């Protein structure tokens, strides 16, 4: 119980320290506020049925990111073909990394189970991170593939609960 929530906290806390320099100080501020709300929610038993799904996705991040990017590159092969923006290994690696970071921020939104803090804190972290990262190739498409790769690992009933969290992020990034 408390140890699986601590796995999620350790995961988010490790994301923040690794991405702080690249995501910029404003995004770091929003992320830490979200983590404190998440721990405030857990302490008071708020929206606790979303952690089990979040944990599955957290244990399967690399699988998810790999499946999403493979699906992204089949749909748009010019991205990784010569002359494409992810042909060079540096920039392909930056793509994969940035996709993994957008994924973990979405999973933070999932854990809260509440659209209010998702729009007032989580989305501000995603938008500020996007502003700090700058050019993120196929940003919107990659989130859709992250969503499909994620729902891939879930039963129909868990998918029907998780999809509205991806769709709220996708919509809000225009």
Q: CB under 8 Å, gap of 24 or more: what pairs does 16-22 form? A: 19/101, 19/129, 22/132, 22/133
Stated as kind and residue range, the H or E segment containing 60 is none
> What domains sit in the chain, N to C, each tagged with a CATH number?
2-172 (1.10.490.20)
Q: Determine the straight-line distance between the first and last CA of the chain, rounded to whole angstroms.
A: 37
d(CA 83, CA 14): 34
Q: Could you give the count of Cα atoms lying within 13 Å of 46 in the half-sphere of its Cβ?
A: 13
Using alpha carbons, select from 89, 174, 99, 81 the residue that is nearest to residue 137. 99
What does each C-alpha distance from 151 to 18, 72, 82, 115, 136 come to in angstroms? Answer: 26, 15, 31, 19, 23
Give the E-state strand segments of the chain in sequence order: none
Tokens of 84: 């494409």
Collect all residues with Cβ–Cβ distance below 8 Å to 44 and sequence separation of at least 6: none
Local structure of residue 118 (DSSP, 8 states): I
């Amino acid at each position: 119980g408390s140890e699986d929530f601590q796995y999620a906290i350790d995961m988010f806390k490790k994301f923040i320290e690794e991405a702080a320099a690249s995501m910029g100080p404003e995004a770091v501020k929003y992320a830490k506020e979200f983590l404190k709300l998440l721990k405030e929610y857990h302490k008071n038993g708020i929206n606790n049925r979303l952690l089990k799904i979040a944990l599955l996705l957290l244990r399967n991040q690399k699988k998810i990111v790999d499946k999403a990017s493979q699906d992204l590159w089949r749909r748009h092969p010019e991205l990784i073909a010569p002359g494409g923006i992810a042909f060079s290994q540096r920039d392909r690696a930056l793509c994969l990394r940035d996709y993994g970071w957008f994924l973990i921020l979405i999973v933070m939104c999932l854990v809260s189970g509440d659209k209010g803090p998702i729009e007032k804190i989580g989305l501000k972290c995603i938008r500020e991170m996007y502003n700090s990262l700058g050019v993120v190739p196929a940003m919107m498409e990659s989130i859709r593939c992250l969503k499909e790769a994620s729902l891939s690992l879930l039963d129909e009933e868990d998918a029907n609960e998780t999809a509205p969290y991806f769709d709220y992020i996708i919509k809000a990034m225009s």
